[PDB]
Design a protein around this motif. Structure first.
Motif: not given
Ligand code: SF4
Ligand code: SF4
Ligand code: FES
Ligand code: FES
Ligand SMILES: [Fe+3]
Ligand SMILES: [Fe+3]
Lengths: 633, 633
Positions: A45-47, A50-51, A53, A65-67, A74, A77
């Motif tokens: 995920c690169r949305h 912070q990614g 991920c 994922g970080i969030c 993921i 989406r």
């Molecule tokens: S922090 Fe969440 S939305 Fe952002 S890239 Fe990582 S998984 Fe995706």
């Protein structure tokens, strides 16, 4: 080279490209291996910034994922965005045709006109637009206005969904909140809900994706409707396909892309320009088709199809392709670089689809004829530059009978039963002469040896008396391997299916059967298959998820194809896919798309990479439908 | 923990989370390292199922995508989709407010009303909607209809662009074809042009992205306009911020997300529900804000801000957060899992934004008061369950003066010059008391120690007499570190800036200066900064790219923030960014966004990860603008 493509003309050009040092799509694929497993499984995920991920499919961290986005969020989406992108392509195509029709009936572009007035009136009635005592240009203006209105919220839902599916199907979709409110509205809502810190429930996300795939279906159906009004509804035609349709002594001009607003004019104008081509030392202008804009002019005019999809670079490698005229979608941008080697003039025509190194000509419907002349004159200049040069056109082509719009199919059937044209088809479903119906759709994909899945699956189904129809590059694969030549019915078709194809063709003044596979047109013309299957459902009084009808996107690639596969499932079809989409990193998501979505829409994806196994699974799905109707199988 | 956040209340809760075994966003970031370099550089593409494709930044193959997409095409396509996603969030927010206003003036939702009638009329006049002799409800109906019309193509461009920027700026953008035709139209066109085999020219792609960022600006400006009509234009207010605003003996209810259609009702209803809270053993309902919906009710009502962005989980770790009421955007889905440890009731309210494990309450504007009562009653039940339990609320909070809408700023200035309120500000720009203006916007990002870039840059600019304004989580970072307490003007502000803040505050009946930083509201309220800067441009007779005005998205994260940064550049602002977006894999793209875009719009990105260097670069950009006006610096 047989491992790259099953098409013998393509294999020949792969050998030429290799000895000339021209890098191909297969070479670029080889240089990508091993591809990233996180991306292949969907677990990336690169949305947000912070990614990036990722999530290990198995083992230790990273697990989330970080969030806090889970694997199933993921994966859902990413899939939703692919659906939205496909919807955006099909609906951009449809939107451009709606503006063209509006301009034409406002006196703003005399190159365009109402060619099919019966279709215009039938669409107006389906939409509830009054026709009685109205000028054609005002009816068309209202139809064009309705088309543009389906792109945004209004007091009705998207009519190119609710008026084209059986009412029982609309009721089922409405109950799950799946009816789109507006085409670009749904696309934007997907992009919103999938951005970071929004929708984080796999089932909720996927339900949004099913609704967006119906916005794609609307775009497809609108595109077909509008192109038929503007350019004519297809009727049966005879032509040829594969590289041998190029002619060393002609100016060879390929129309490539999807929207024929351009290419249909090129076809007309090239005829006028022939003496100007003859003056340059050519026999005239040989317009040939690549990809879906090729299917469009093949369907309406019998323009021979040169090649498709993954093999599109091969047409240039012949050395005889003087120009390739692009609008948008599925054009490998490599062609701009390859042209510096092969001498082809690559011309883009659409403002939002340019390629660095290609010549751009700003097409406008207001100036379509003038633009086409300028474009064709670049092609004639290019032909002169290769005067006397040696070319290598493989002497390989097939006979293609095509043009099977749903109207044409119904008319053909009407020769067996004038007042009840669908009944002869259902009769032969019921008695077993026709086991079922399979739609082959979608792309080629460099991961699959070209055409191998389409032909392997088709041969098995045709032997089992399945009526096979095809669109897009599935039609392209079957046409290049002889599946649209009626001379191959004896070899290819079961006895029941052969009897039916023979009975219909003979009643239509041909002395011979229909072809083994019915070519129903371009990728947006998957909507034609919907219209046929919906008519069958209404004639039988059942929903689509009770019909012995399946689909196979046997070698799919494009986000457009992901959208088409998803709405095939949403309208109730068992839908085989032959390349795994990035969903295997989430078992819950895979489980929804292959099993539990059955409980919502009655359709489901059939994931099967092995084409022999896929054909078995498609037959099993067809035969389970037969059993549910109490039919023998 | 100081390496994770500079906020001392956050550090305290990081220690509590650690000893209790609650995994945080910083722990999940640690478990992601090392992050993928292809994604970090932008050199990865999954736009079709032949992928995933990657490109080595340096060295040998892979050098090009399988379809032939180059590094610069892949990087531009990915960036364009981030812009489109951000536009989709801001415009979904605006669209929901437009429907709410329409329902309210149709008698369909009595909880909502025209609260700011002056704003309604001023917007109607700006749009050219006649007001003379019209009922307010019909004027608002026309304004709501105009808002919804900007989402699709029509005979005018998007009016929430063309009517809100100076005419010279509109002319410059029109000449490059950058004016959006419709908000969701542009979003869909981005998704189309970036899908496989479409647009493959970096400059063409990026120009499309600049136009889509202006669709985002329109969404932001529409959102602010509509929220002010419905809920009131902000005026100066005094409140507090950081975790110490939670109260162990109250029912602590956090409003979290972005759209206040929900949270504004919660604020009103919670007041009525106080005796029902007192009966449960609480002092009453303590509504607190997280993220932008927190800023909305802080701006309008003085609701204390509890925390923001990356640290949002920390509010729960106190053990005193009885409920957290979600609409959409920037909500870490981890909160649903953390709540099983902390006892917080997490409640989603929007159909397209659900979180697995959270309680969902289907909010509808038609039933807003009833829904709020049901939601608050879940919170009171939760408070009872922790009766007598020990909580750890850090005894840490700051004083926050906020509410500086552009109207409020102009009114405050009007006390120094009644008929020419902008002139006192320009006077002090010209004489040097105000060196320039800096807008701090955007998110926190786990990659940057929380608030470190915002505070370090702000301290240097304030010392150099820059007037600093802030929105979103940039306002959140500065407020939590005392930058909105007028008691800190002596410590923080240069003498020239101090003199100006003191003169304005004293003329506004305060005996004291304005705060060191002016809080201009939520993320959509970046549109308020546009309105102010546009008014300054019009008063000076110059375009925005001649003003000593810059922006800094010092710690940005969200696709929404990428869109905001891009339109800051498109309207002509030097725009610092403090986390690198995935563009460094393409030098040509980086060169366009940091240098050559100057020649198109006059703005440009300033990429600088080191905040001390960033402040120097922002001062240099401000001082170059001063020199271009012939001002000393
Ligand atoms: S922090 Fe969440 S939305 Fe952002 S890239 Fe990582 S998984 Fe995706
Ligand atoms: S669009 Fe091109 S670069 Fe992207 S995944 Fe497909 S083949 Fe690879
Ligand atoms: S980690 Fe390879 S696709 Fe992102
Ligand atoms: S290869 Fe890691 S982001 Fe795709
Ligand atoms: Fe194709
Ligand atoms: Fe936030």
């Amino acid at each position: 080279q047989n491992l790259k493509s099953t098409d013998r003309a393509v294999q020949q050009m792969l050998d030429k490209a290799k000895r000339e040092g021209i890098q191909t799509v297969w070479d670029r694929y080889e240089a990508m291996k091993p591809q990233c497993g996180f991306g292949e499984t969907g677990l990336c995920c690169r949305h947000c910034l912070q990614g990036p991920c990722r999530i290990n499919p198995f083992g230790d961290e990273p697990k989330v994922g970080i969030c806090g986005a889970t694997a199933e969020v993921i994966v859902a989406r990413g899939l939703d965005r692919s659906i939205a992108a496909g919807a955006a392509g099909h609906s951009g195509h449809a939107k451009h045709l709606a503006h063209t029709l509006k301009k034409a009936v406002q006196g703003k572009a005399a190159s365009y006109m109402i060619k099919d007035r019966t279709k215009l009136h039938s669409i107006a009635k389906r939409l509830g637009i009054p026709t009685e005592g109205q000028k054609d240009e005002d009816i068309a203006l209202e139809v064009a206005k309705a088309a543009l209105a389906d792109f945004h919220e209004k007091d009705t839902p998207v009519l190119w969904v609710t008026t084209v599916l059986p009412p029982s199907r609309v009721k089922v979709l409405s109950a799950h909140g799946l009816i789109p409110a507006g085409i670009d509205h749904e696309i934007a809502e997907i992009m919103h809900r999938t951005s970071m810190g929004c929708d984080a429930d796999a089932q909720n996300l996927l339900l949004g994706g099913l609704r967006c795939s119906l916005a794609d279906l609307a775009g497809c159906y609108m595109g077909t409707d509008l192109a038929d009004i503007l350019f004519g509804t297809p009727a049966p035609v005879v032509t040829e396909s594969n590289l041998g349709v190029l002619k060393a002594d002609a100016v060879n001009v390929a129309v490539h892309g999807h929207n024929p607003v351009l290419s249909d004019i090129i076809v007309s104008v090239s005829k006028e320009m022939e003496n100007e081509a003859r003056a340059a030392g050519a026999t005239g202008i040989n317009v040939v088709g690549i990809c879906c804009t090729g299917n469009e002019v093949l369907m309406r005019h019998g323009i021979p199809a040169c090649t498709h999809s993954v093999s599109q670079e091969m047409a240039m490698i012949t050395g005889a392709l003087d120009a390739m005229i692009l609008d948008y979608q599925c054009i490998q941008p490599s062609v701009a670089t390859i042209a510096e080697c092969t001498g082809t003039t690559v011309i883009t025509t659409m403002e939002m689809s340019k390629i660095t190194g290609a010549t751009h000509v700003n097409f406008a419907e207001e100036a379509a004829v003038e633009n086409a002349k300028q474009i064709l004159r670049l092609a004639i200049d290019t032909f002169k530059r290769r005067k006397g040069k040696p070319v290598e056109i493989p002497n390989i082509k097939t006979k293609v009978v095509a043009g099977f719009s749903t109207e044409a199919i119904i008319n053909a059937l009407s020769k067996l039963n004038a007042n009840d044209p669908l009944k002869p088809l259902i009769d032969n479903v019921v008695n077993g002469n026709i086991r079922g119906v399979c739609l082959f759709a979608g792309c080629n994909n460099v991961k699959v040896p070209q055409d191998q899945n389409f032909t392997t699956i088709a041969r098995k189904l045709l032997k089992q008396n399945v009526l096979v129809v095809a669109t897009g590059c599935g039609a392209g694969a079957l046409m290049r391997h002889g599946f649209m030549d009626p001379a191959n019915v004896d070899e290819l078709c079961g006895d029941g299916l052969k009897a039916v194809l023979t009975a219909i063709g003979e009643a239509n003044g041909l002395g011979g059967p229909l072809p083994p596979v019915l070519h129903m047109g371009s990728c947006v013309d998957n909507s034609r298959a919907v219209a046929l299957v919906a008519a069958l459902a209404n004639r039988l009084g059942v929903d689509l998820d009770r019909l012995p009808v399946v689909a196979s996107a046997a070698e799919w690639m494009h986000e457009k194809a992901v959208a088409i596969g998803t709405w095939a499932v949403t309208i109730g079809l068992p839908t085989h896919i032959g390349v795994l989409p990035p969903i295997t990193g989430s078992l819950p998501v895979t489980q929804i798309l292959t099993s539990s979505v059955k409980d919502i829409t009655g359709g489901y994806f059939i994931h099967e990479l092995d084409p022999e196994t896929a054909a078995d699974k498609l037959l099993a799905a067809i035969n389970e439908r037969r059993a549910g109707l109490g039919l023998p199988w």
